[PDB]
Q: What sequence folds into this?
């Protein structure tokens, strides 16, 4: 009604809805005339509608896709990384998949459990040097010697390359499960973090279980990043209310 | 003069009697006819030709009301499109193939399409318990390299009469 | 290479003057042939003399050492063109990356208002009007300048307009942008063929980072020749 | 709580000590839960035998391309001189990704160092020089078995009197298309003055991932004429000269020789996806073939019958499954239509289990060599005919279709051999349980998905992801809401699709406000027994708008970090811009 | 108008173009030269300028010697001397 579009969404829907609208046909209405609320009325009706609008169909959907878990463990143990794109929060999926299901099954099969490094990549305070500090005490690799370090190089990338050539002479058992939430988040989409996380997925002895939120996500990875990940993509879009992450972002009036 | 086609004539006046005749040609039920003639009230002025939208409607809302009828034989799958190709005075079947594609995204998130696809459990041809395991990429999905379980026994029953 | 040519050709009518005169004549030939090319630089003449010397000794046969003119008429091929470059095909890229380079070349030289007159081709069902196009052809030739800056949705829209047909009613043959299109687009950004506003360590996933091509026309014509895409009639309404 | 507010919290999951079962393999019970556990164990061990036999050949090919490449480069790196003797050797490695190790020979009384250089290791000329002379002094003073020098070309000047050996440094620029050429020709100019020192031998090795008309367009012409003194080119790419696609696809047939078959659609999908990617194809070959194998042994129970010892575990459900193959239907229709024996088709139709149970085990001695004859066509084209520009995958595709003669006449070089290179094969009954295939779109959905299209489809239609229910409505909190009301963030997208390019957020809110039920949600909002705050706002005479703005603003600030909405006009954030269109 | 002048192709006018920036007849668009102190010549040695990452024949150069000053210094017995007027 408020769009005079002849076509709808294709390339000609792009070319058709990008017209030029005059100054009187426009509707300059500020959102001040929207009926203002408090922060606590939002905070109340939000957490009401999260778990009381489509709660049983969403639990039905999670039980539908919860019998998919042995295929995820099979794909992880055969070398691939996993990537869970979709509408809604994939957070509790990976918290109920990697903690509950996956590492008990990995720990039994090679006979404490298998360490799970969760990584809240929707938090913009996500440096890769303290994350790699957290990797280098769950594996504790060797140090960078004088000949193998270079003239003012990056020590993290050289250490991961040293771990890569170390773990070609090793048994193939999962030693860590690295659970990245919102892999294209605002401090992890940058290039050296992705070089780190792409060189970590070269190692067979670590299972990467990632998740994305943005829609132009796959152009973060070229023929070198998408080859060292070797993702397998799984649309597990489950329409979650996504209220763990929205406390980080601005909910400004 | 002979007619070339019927989905050519621009701004031909179409009343609801022709639309309900075209709906009762395909034996489509009441609650889909009372959406096909009620949508014509909505977009009537902005119509370059009203023998394309009503033409594509009665194959888009025909494939969703008779979905289980098509799964046993592919003869009805050609029967409805050939009936529409000869009812629209058209020699080329491709021009009514393009009709449902041009009208299909015009009604994709419509209301009556939304609660009419669940009524027959169509969900673009393949039902819900077969498509929710196809969106997740499950290796335990039903690929059609065999024949369907209710179809093998009816393949068996057409053999006992060819020997007795 | 000359002192083996004098015995390969059985040349006995020679002395040291008969070598140094053809040497000085060759140097004068490179000078009067290539001085308008180089300039007054000894270094750009030294290497031309080093290049074109044995291909000039390979043209003396039995009596070109006595005359100065039919030897120059026996080697006129190496005194017209310089032949200094490092030399078939154009680029060893994929098909969708070549069409992505072509579409990024199109959208960063075309004004964004005039594309619904060049690419919009499908039959309407609703009352709408297409783009009329530009009235007057501007003869400033925009593809001499620096390119423009576009959003990635315009590249993906022009990409599926110019793409050839692929793939009987459930195909929907108009190719959508899968993983491989985005992966090849990021590969083109890595190979510095499409490029952007280089802020230091820019995020690709922002609605404020716009893209541009930085390959010239002379390789885009060879690319559009390789995939056989008529691109000469895309900039026909400018010159 | 407050653990999802700090980045990288590691978590050790505690575990129950034992459950004492065989659940150490992911292979579920197939045949709708009728399979035996020993067959699942044999299926897992059989898949691992096949996967190990494949990857032990893939690793030898992948570690043989390096022994071919180190043999290739180190022959035109040496064994040649130039009469000018004041030039550096130059090797342009075309199409190569920077992934190769270079070996330098003995050549005693002369050091040979390799100085790898990177676009991160080169922000200007002085860091290139300091890193290069640092690597030179390190790889000179550590290959000797004591003062500190400055890292510039003076070490190259007095390398003869510092150590006693002649220098031969071989530079190696890793991503030559990614360095500044303005820094690179400055470095080449700065290296050119090393010619006057009579004990050096500079060699340059360029790893180019594009064509050579894009390197000699960006360089300066004097550097190009310096590089035209002793230059060689070398095409290093695994698509040139199809030898490593004719050794990965050849070795995949050596694992499936007789047990499995490949479909037509599968090999043409391989050819379509290997041609839309040029840089790495020896990896996109293996990660399609392995994922084809993994979706087979996870799905096909009859994989346990690809070994000729498990022939006796034909239960009743296997006989149900194999009977409804359409090739067997074509065979039984053949047994009807040519002649009429009654009591054999009456046996093998539905009654006799022993005839069908023993009939299938005859169908495994058959071979019908597709991949047993294709190696003969490969050896004929390589050895007797000497044509090394053929593709085994595409030749195998045409041999599988049957139009192989067109592909053999594509060269017009073997006209006297179109009978010798001919083979017309047929189908063997029960192929269609033993074929690697893609007719469900599985290798498409989970290796190369239409990502943005799937996101938009789940945003728009949403009934293919959320169920509809018919019993669980009264014990719930929202039973009548799943049928009359679309989910917010999936309802707002229906208005986002048919909006303009500039969407006023107040009009985008009003269009969302009048697509909600009014007389249902004002009854629904008073349902909670515990809290008391949610009911008093329903006692306010403007409840519907104050509950509508919460859901609208939640959906808007949920779309925004997904990528569909750009807030233009900062310090206003009132007029959003649609920036993702469906179908593209 | 007419024995002539050989038109050199754009594969050989590149060397001429580079020889007229190594004689300072063209500058770039806003490129400052040598910096004043030693740190500002270091702070810019780590910067990667946009005028050197774009292709060669699109760098927006700038004249050192205008056409009026070119008119009076070229001798009037030249075959391009009429072309210095505008």
A:
């Amino acid at each position: 009604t408020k769009s005079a579009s002849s076509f709808l969404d294709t390339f000609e829907g792009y070319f058709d809805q990008r017209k030029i609208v005059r100054t009187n046909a426009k509707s300059r209405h500020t959102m001040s005339m929207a009926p203002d609320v408090t922060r606590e009325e939002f905070s109340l009706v939000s957490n009401f509608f999260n778990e009381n609008f489509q709660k049983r169909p969403r639990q039905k959907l999670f039980e539908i896709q919860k019998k998919m878990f042995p295929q995820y463990w099979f794909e992880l143990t055969q070398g691939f990384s996993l990537l869970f794109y979709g509408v809604g929060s994939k957070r509790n999926f990976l918290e109920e998949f990697a903690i509950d299901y996956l590492s008990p099954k990995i720990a039994y099969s090679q006979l404490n459990s298998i360490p799970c490094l969760i990584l809240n990549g929707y938090n913009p305070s996500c440096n890769y040097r303290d994350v790699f500090k957290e990797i280098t005490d769950l594996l504790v690799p060797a140090e960078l010697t004088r000949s193998e370090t270079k003239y003012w190089g990056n020590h993290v990338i050289l250490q991961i390359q040293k771990m890569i050539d170390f773990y070609k002479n090793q048994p193939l058992d999962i030693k860590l499960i690295l659970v990245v939430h919102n892999l294209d988040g605002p401090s992890i989409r940058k290039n050296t973090f992705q070089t780190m996380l792409s060189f970590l997925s070269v190692i067979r002895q670590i299972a990467i279980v990632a998740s994305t939120d943005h829609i132009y996500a796959p152009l973060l990875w070229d023929n070198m990043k998408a080859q060292n990940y070797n993702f397998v993509f799984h649309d597990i879009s489950n329409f979650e209310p996504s209220t763990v992450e929205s406390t980080f972002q601005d909910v400004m009036k | 003069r002979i007619p070339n086609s019927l989905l050519v004539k621009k701004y031909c006046k179409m009343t609801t009697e022709e639309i309900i005749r075209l709906c009762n040609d395909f034996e489509l039920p009441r609650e889909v006819a009372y959406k096909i003639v009620d949508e014509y009230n909505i977009n009537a002025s902005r119509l370059v030709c009203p023998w394309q939208l009503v033409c594509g409607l009665v194959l888009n809302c025909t494939f969703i009301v008779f979905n289980e009828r098509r799964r046993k034989d592919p003869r009805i799958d050609h029967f409805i499109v050939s009936k529409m190709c000869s009812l629209m005075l058209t020699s080329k079947v491709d021009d009514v193939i393009e009709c449902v594609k041009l009208v299909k995204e015009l009604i994709i998130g419509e209301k009556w399409f939304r609660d009419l696809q669940i009524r027959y459990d169509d969900f673009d041809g393949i039902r819900y318990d077969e498509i929710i395991f196809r969106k997740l990429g499950s290796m335990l999905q039903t690929t059609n390299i065999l024949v369907t379980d209710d179809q093998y026994n009816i393949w068996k029953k057409r053999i006992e009469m060819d020997l007795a | 290479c000359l002192r083996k040519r004098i015995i390969e050709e059985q040349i006995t009518d020679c002395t040291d003057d008969q070598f140094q005169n053809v040497a000085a004549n060759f140097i004068h030939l490179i000078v009067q042939a290539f001085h308008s090319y180089t300039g007054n630089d000894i270094f750009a003449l030294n290497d031309l003399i080093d290049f074109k010397w044995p291909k000039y000794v390979s043209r003396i046969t039995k009596e070109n050492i006595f005359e100065p003119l039919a030897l120059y008429k026996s080697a006129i091929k190496l005194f017209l063109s310089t032949d200094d470059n490092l030399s078939s095909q154009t680029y060893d890229l994929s098909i969708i990356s070549k069409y992505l380079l072509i579409a990024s070349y199109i959208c960063s030289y075309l004004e964004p208002r005039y594309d619904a007159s060049i690419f919009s081709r499908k039959t309407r069902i609703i009352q709408g009007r297409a783009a009329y196009g530009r009235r007057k052809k501007k003869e400033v030739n925009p593809r001499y300048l620096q390119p423009s800056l576009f959003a990635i949705e315009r590249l993906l829209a022009i990409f599926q307009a110019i793409f050839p047909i692929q793939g009987a009613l459930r195909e929907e043959s108009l190719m959508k942008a899968n993983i491989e299109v985005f992966q090849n687009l990021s590969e083109l950004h890595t190979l510095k063929l499409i490029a952007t506003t280089m802020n230091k360590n820019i995020d690709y996933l922002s609605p404020k980072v716009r893209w541009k091509v930085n390959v010239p026309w002379e390789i885009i014509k060879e690319i559009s020749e390789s995939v056989h895409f008529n691109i000469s009639d895309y900039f026909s309404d400018i010159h | 709580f407050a653990d999802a507010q700090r980045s990288h919290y590691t978590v050790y999951p505690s575990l129950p000590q034992s459950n004492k079962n065989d659940k150490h393999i992911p292979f579920v019970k197939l045949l709708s839960g009728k399979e035996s556990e020993v067959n699942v164990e044999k299926r897992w061990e059989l898949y691992h035998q096949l996967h190990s036999h494949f990857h032990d050949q893939v690793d030898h090919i992948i570690d043989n391309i390096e022994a071919d490449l180190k043999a290739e480069i180190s022959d035109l790196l040496y064994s040649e001189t130039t009469q000018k003797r004041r030039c550096f050797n130059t090797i342009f490695l075309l199409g190569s990704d920077s992934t190769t190790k270079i070996e330098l020979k003995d050549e005693s009384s002369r050091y040979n160092v390799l100085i790898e250089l990177t676009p991160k290791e080169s922000p200007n000329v002085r860091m290139m020089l300091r890193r290069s002379m640092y690597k030179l002094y390190s790889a000179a003073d550590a290959e000797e078995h004591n003062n500190d020098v400055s890292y510039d070309l003076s070490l190259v000047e007095n390398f003869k009197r510092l150590f006693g050996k002649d220098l031969a440094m071989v530079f190696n620029f890793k991503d030559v298309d990614s360095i500044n050429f303005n820094t690179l020709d400055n470095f080449i100019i700065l290296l050119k003055s090393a010619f006057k020192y009579d004990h050096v031998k500079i060699s340059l090795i360029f790893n180019i991932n594009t064509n050579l008309s894009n390197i000699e367009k960006n360089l300066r012409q004097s550097t190009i004429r310096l590089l035209k003194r002793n230059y060689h080119k070398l095409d290093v790419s695994s698509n040139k000269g199809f030898k490593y696609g004719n050794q990965i696809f050849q070795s995949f047939l050596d694992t499936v020789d007789g047990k499995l078959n490949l479909s037509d659609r599968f090999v043409e999908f391989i050819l379509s996806k290997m041609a839309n990617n040029t840089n790495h194809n020896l990896q996109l070959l293996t990660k399609m073939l392995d994922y084809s194998l993994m979706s087979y042994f996870f799905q096909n129970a009859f994989s346990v019958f690809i070994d000729p010892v498990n022939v006796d575990f034909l239960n009743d459900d296997y006989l149900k499954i194999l009977s409804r193959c359409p090739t067997f239907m074509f065979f039984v229709e053949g047994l009807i239509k040519q002649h009429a024996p009654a009591d054999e088709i009456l046996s093998l139709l539905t009654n006799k289990n022993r005839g069908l149970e023993e009939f299938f085990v005859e169908f495994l001695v058959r071979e019908n060599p597709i991949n047993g004859h294709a190696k003969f066509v490969a050896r004929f084209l390589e050895e007797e005919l000497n044509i090394t520009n053929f593709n085994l995958i595409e030749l195998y595709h045409n041999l599988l279709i049957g139009k192989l003669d067109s592909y053999l006449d594509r060269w017009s070089a073997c006209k006297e051999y179109k009978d010798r290179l001919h083979f017309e094969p047929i189908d063997t009954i029960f192929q269609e349980l033993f074929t690697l295939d893609n007719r469900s779109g599985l290798l498409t959905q989970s290796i190369f998905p239409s990502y943005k299209s799937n996101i938009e489809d789940n945003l728009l239609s949403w009934e293919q992801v959320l169920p509809s229910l018919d019993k669980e409505n009264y014990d719930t909190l929202s039973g009548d809401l799943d049928k009359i009301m679309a989910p917010v963030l999936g309802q707002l997208f229906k208005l986002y699709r048919e909006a303009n390019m500039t969407i006023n957020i107040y009009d985008f809110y009003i269009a969302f406000r009048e697509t909600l039920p009014k007389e249902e949600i004002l009854n629904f909002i008073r349902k909670d027994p515990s809290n008391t705050k949610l009911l008093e706002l329903a006692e306010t005479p403007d409840a519907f708008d104050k509950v509508a703005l919460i859901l609208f603003m939640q959906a808007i600030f949920a779309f925004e970090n997904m990528g569909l909405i750009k807030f233009q006009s900062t310090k206003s954030y009132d007029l959003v811009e649609k920036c993702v269109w469906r179908g593209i | 108008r007419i024995n002539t002048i050989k038109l050199w192709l754009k594969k050989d006018v590149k060397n001429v173009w580079e020889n007229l920036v190594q004689l300072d007849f063209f500058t770039e668009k806003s490129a400052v030269g040598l910096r004043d102190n030693a740190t500002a010549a270091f702070y810019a040695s780590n910067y990667q300028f946009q005028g050197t990452m774009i292709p060669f024949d699109l760098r927006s150069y700038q004249m050192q010697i205008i056409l009026q000053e070119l008119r009076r210094i070229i001798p009037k017995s030249n075959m391009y001397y009429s072309w210095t007027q505008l």
Q: What stands out?
A: Chain E has three helices and two strands. Chains E and B do not touch (no CB pair under 8 Å). The longest strand of chain E covers residues 26-27.
